[PDB]
Every structure is written in C-alpha cells, then in structure tokens.
C-alpha cells in the first residue's frame, strides 16, 4: 500500500541487498530518506545482532526451507504469513523477519542467485506490509521503529 510499502520496500531491500554482498548503495532513497536511512542503520545494529544470536534457529529454518531457485523464492508466501502472523505483534518479530530475509540473501549471494534477493525483499515487504499494516501505521511506522530501537544518546 503506497508510501508505506515503498519506503519498506526500499528499506528492506537495501539492507538485504547490503548484506549479501558488502557493498552500500549510494543511490537516493525517496519521500522519507532521512528516516529510511536511519532505518537502514538500525537494521545493520539490532539485525546482525539477531542473526548471530539465532543463527541455529536460522539455519534450521534455511535447511529446512531448501531454497535453489527464484521459484522458491515466489513460494515462501504461505509459510512466512503462518510463522510470522502467529503471537504477539512488536518490533522484535519484524527484525527477526527482516534479519533472516538478509541471512537467506547471504546464502541466494553464495549458490550464485543474486537475482533472487529482490523478489524475496519483495515477498517480505508484501508480508510484512499486509500483516501488520493498522499496527505499523499506529506505531507511526519507520519512524515508530527508529525511536524504539534508539540508542539513549
Ligand atoms: O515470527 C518469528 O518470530 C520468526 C521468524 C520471522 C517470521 C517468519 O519469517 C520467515 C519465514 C519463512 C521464510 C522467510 C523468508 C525470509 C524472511 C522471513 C521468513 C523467523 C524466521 C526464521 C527462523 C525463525 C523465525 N521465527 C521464530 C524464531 C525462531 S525460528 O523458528
């Protein structure tokens, strides 16, 4: 949905893309780049803590996931919503979901399928924005997100 889904898109993407490779795009963000850049920077703090803290659980899940191909990619959809719309709603869940979205682009960067990393920024963006819209809206969205991960300094 509109501004919304694209400032995320480009957020998520971004921080996918970022991480399966290691290079930073420099090319502008849009409508809202100061807080997508700061976005961006809480993702590579609070995300790459996750992947480390969970990367059994993650590699458990990647396994269990097989994923080869873009086709594979384009059929996440259904086991994403059932994992990711089951519980409680806060902004850890959504780190958890965009941290291993980067975890599956490292291993899409690895097997040569780097093409793959944005439909899957895609998928997740679709996810995320169509589960969690009226909270995410509520929540002041990106900006909501910066602030609660804002580091008392
Ligand atoms: O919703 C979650 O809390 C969750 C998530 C986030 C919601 C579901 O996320 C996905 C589920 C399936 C495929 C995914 C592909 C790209 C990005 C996220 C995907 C999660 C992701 C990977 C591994 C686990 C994940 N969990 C549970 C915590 C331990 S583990 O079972």
């Not at 919304?4 to 795009?25: C, F, H, M, N, V």
């Not at 803590?49 to 996440?76: C, P, W, Y």
């Not at 291993?107 to 589960?131: F, G, M, W, Y």
């Amino acid at each position: 949905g509109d501004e919304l889904y694209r400032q995320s898109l480009e957020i998520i993407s971004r921080y996918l893309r970022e991480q399966a490779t290691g290079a930073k795009d420099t090319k502008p963000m849009g409508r809202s780049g100061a807080t997508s850049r700061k976005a961006l920077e809480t993702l590579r703090r609070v995300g790459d803590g996750v992947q480390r803290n969970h990367e059994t659980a993650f590699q458990g899940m990647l396994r269990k996931l097989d994923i080869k191909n873009e086709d594979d990619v384009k059929s996440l959809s259904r086991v994403m919503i059932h994992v990711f719309s089951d519980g409680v709603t806060n902004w850890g869940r959504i780190v958890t979901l965009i941290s291993f979205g980067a975890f599956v682009a490292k291993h899409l960067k690895t097997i040569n399928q780097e093409s793959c990393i944005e439909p899957l920024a895609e998928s997740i963006t679709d996810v995320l924005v169509r589960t969690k819209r009226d909270w995410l809206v509520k929540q002041r969205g990106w900006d909501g997100f910066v602030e609660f991960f804002h580091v008392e300094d």
